[PDB]
Amino acid sequence: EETRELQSLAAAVVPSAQTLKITDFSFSDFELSDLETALCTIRMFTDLNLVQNFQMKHEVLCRWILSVKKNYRKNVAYHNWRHAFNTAQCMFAALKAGKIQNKLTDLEILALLIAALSHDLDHRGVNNSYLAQLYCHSIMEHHHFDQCLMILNSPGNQILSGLSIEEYKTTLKIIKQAILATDLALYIKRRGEFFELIRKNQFNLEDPHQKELFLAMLMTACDLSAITKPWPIQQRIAELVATEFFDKNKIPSMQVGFIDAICLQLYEALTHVSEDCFPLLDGCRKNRQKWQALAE
Ligand SMILES: CCCOc1ccc(C(=O)CN2CCN(C)CC2)cc1-c1nc(C(C)C)c(Br)c(=O)[nH]1
Ligand SMILES: [Mg+2]
Ligand SMILES: [Zn+2]
Question: Whose CA is nearest to atom 9 of ligand 1?
Fold first, then answer.
């Protein structure tokens, strides 16, 4: 059943980015099979020039995508492969349609796409604590990175084998920071600086410190990007979140609070960095109006 999936995936035609709607901010996966999401993932790698620039063999990338998909848990309502897949599509869309791609290096883009796909690996649900104890420091995100690394090191799955050891180490580090950044605690701590810098037109991507901060903010933006979706889609994703959160009348005001506290300023900030990411902010504002109206 596994080689069959690999055989079938490796033998399929990969449709264009246009055919697959993968450049749209309003993209939805509900109508896609797992196979189809795997094909969209290949297309994302190829059209970001990653397959070319890093000499990835087709069967290795296919196997890697399948390993990643398999290491999410289907029984988890929201934090599963479709969430990761959606997070990466949003990354792809921000890079392409959002014109973020030109601001970054090839290695940065490679790391971000891998991070996006890998950032919740082996997640067991927000209400699960499976522990050995010992608090935070982003323990879950460290686990996700560890799972990402293990897959990258797996026989037949080494899509980074084409990089030199120096490139490899640099990219692993970007991937690690990128995944660690999806800890909402780290986002809240590092937020203010990002907003402060933009507030004064002080923001500059050339400074390595600010580049790294931006990559962190970008990860969170894609991670949360379901609340930017067209209303019929957001309503449905919110169903999944609600299901995992309690594995419904207070939900509208929760969503408004979430949007106000965490989402709005982020998407406003992103749109400042790049005008073309505006549809994310527009979508987020549109969902605030819908949720608020429900809250009465
Ligand atoms: C849909 C069912 C209810 O979901 C939520 C409920 C509450 C929250 C909050 O963050 C609420 N608190 C309340 C206190 N406040 C300062 C704002 C933050 C987020 C969510 C939420 N989290 C997420 C992600 C972080 C998983 C998404 Br995506 C989402 O659409 N909603
Ligand atoms: Mg996470
Ligand atoms: Zn996530």
Answer: 258
How many helices and strands (H and E) does the chain possess? 15, 0
Domain that holds residue 15: 1-296
State the DSSP string of 198-224: HHTT---TTSHHHHHHHHHHHHHHHHT
Solving technique: X-ray
Supply 61's token pair: 């990338």
In the numeric block, the tokens 């490796």 are attached to 10
Q: Whose CA is nearest to atom 25 of ligand 1?
A: 224
| CA neighbor of 146 nearest in space, from 222, 60, 71 | 71
Domains held by the chain: number: 1
Q: CA angle, corner 229, sides to 210 and 188, nearest 5?
A: 35
Residue 76 Cβ contacting ligand 1 at under 6 Å: no
Question: CATH no. for residue 258?
Answer: 1.10.1300.10
For residue 126, the ligand 1 atom closest to its alpha carbon is 26
Residue 90 in contact with ligand 1 by CB distance below 6 A: no
